[PDB]
């Protein structure tokens, strides 16, 4: 049979080659081949030669020049329609057991679903669930239930297959219209974009109301509205004022972390000797951690906001 021929091929190609092939095979195929492999006792020379001949004849046809379909498709979609459309199309293309289905669900919904269950059952399901999903679910539980689950998981001794099957059937029965669960449309960022499109008086009202509410997401939107990479679109005088109001080291670090166009714009806005000194210091220095560069850019953006509010800078 073809399974026997594949088993003989895997035996005769070497452990490394067979292991590499199994990395390109599904779980069912790997399990079936391994089960067939363990029962192999003899492989005669005629059988070996026939297997080699058949495999070579099959490989003559393909010879398919295998391509990484996922990576190539992602790159094509990105370079064609941007990151957002590419990611949306990949999600559409990508889109089962009850436990596996729960792993494909929202944390709060699954948490409330299993919350109406015996704590041992909750612990068993969470063990059978993905670690990240289980951690998200447990963070939403009450302190007493969370402690009970953590205690039970620390003393988990395995479940009977019949109990596992019954639990899976119950979870399947409890399922709802989870098809196309959740949707990425917008929020916060879209609100910031809309605010940027509303009048100066309207954005004054916006500052007012956002400060009035929770305050935390208000500051988050303060940070979000306008970014450091948007400084390239500002007029030269505002950039020069920023150079005046920004320390040399912070500006140098920010330019190091920024794009060559923004760096060249800042250098042009600087004097010749100062720009040359900045370039020399950049060349003579070493790599800077991303956190430090981000902090310096945040400080520079705070200075940008301060100058813009006073009217010295136009955004």
């Amino acid at each position: 049979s073809g399974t026997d021929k594949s088993v003989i091929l895997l035996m005769t190609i070497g452990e490394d080659r067979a292991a590499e092939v199994f990395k390109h095979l599904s779980t069912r195929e790997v399990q079936a081949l391994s089960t067939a492999m363990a029962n192999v006792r003899q492989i005669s020379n005629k059988q070996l030669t026939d297997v080699l001949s058949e495999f070579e004849q099959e490989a003559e046809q393909f010879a398919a020049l295998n391509i990484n379909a996922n990576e190539y498709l992602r790159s094509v979609l990105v370079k064609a329609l941007g990151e957002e459309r590419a990611s949306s199309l990949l999600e559409d293309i990508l889109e089962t057991s009850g436990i596996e289905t729960l792993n494909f669900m929202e944390p709060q919904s699954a948490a409330d679903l299993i919350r109406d269950e015996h704590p041992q059952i909750i612990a068993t399901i969470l063990v059978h669930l993905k670690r990240s999903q289980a951690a998200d679910i447990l963070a939403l539980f009450d302190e007493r239930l969370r402690h009970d689950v953590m205690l039970r998981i620390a003393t988990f001794g395995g479940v009977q297959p019949a109990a596992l099957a019954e639990l899976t059937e119950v979870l399947n029965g409890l399922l709802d219209g989870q098809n196309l669960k959740r949707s990425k449309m917008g929020g916060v960022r879209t609100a910031a974009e809309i605010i940027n499109l509303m009048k100066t008086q309207q954005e004054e009202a916006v500052i007012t109301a956002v400060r009035e509410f929770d305050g935390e997401l208000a500051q988050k939107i303060i940070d979000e509205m306008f970014l450091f990479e948007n400084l390239v679109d500002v007029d030269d005088r505002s950039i020069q004022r920023l150079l005046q109001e920004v320390d040399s080291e912070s500006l140098l670090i920010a330019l190091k972390g920024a794009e060559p166009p923004l760096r060249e714009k800042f250098l042009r806005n600087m004097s010749q000797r100062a720009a040359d000194i900045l370039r020399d210091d950049l060349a003579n220095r070493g790599p800077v951690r991303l956190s430090q560069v981000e902090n310096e850019q945040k400080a520079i953006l705070l200075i940008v906001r301060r100058l813009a509010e006073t009217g010295e800078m136009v955004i």
Binding site: G2, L9, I13, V21, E58, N66
Partner: peptide, 27 residues
């Protein structure tokens, strides 16, 4: 045991996986 074994060992693992899948389907 000629050089055919070495040539097969040098083939791409994806090709071997596809051949194995085809044989399993034909089973």
């Amino acid at each position: 045991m000629s050089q055919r074994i070495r040539e097969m060992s040098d083939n791409d693992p994806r090709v071997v996986a596809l051949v194995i899948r085809q044989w399993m389907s034909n089973d």
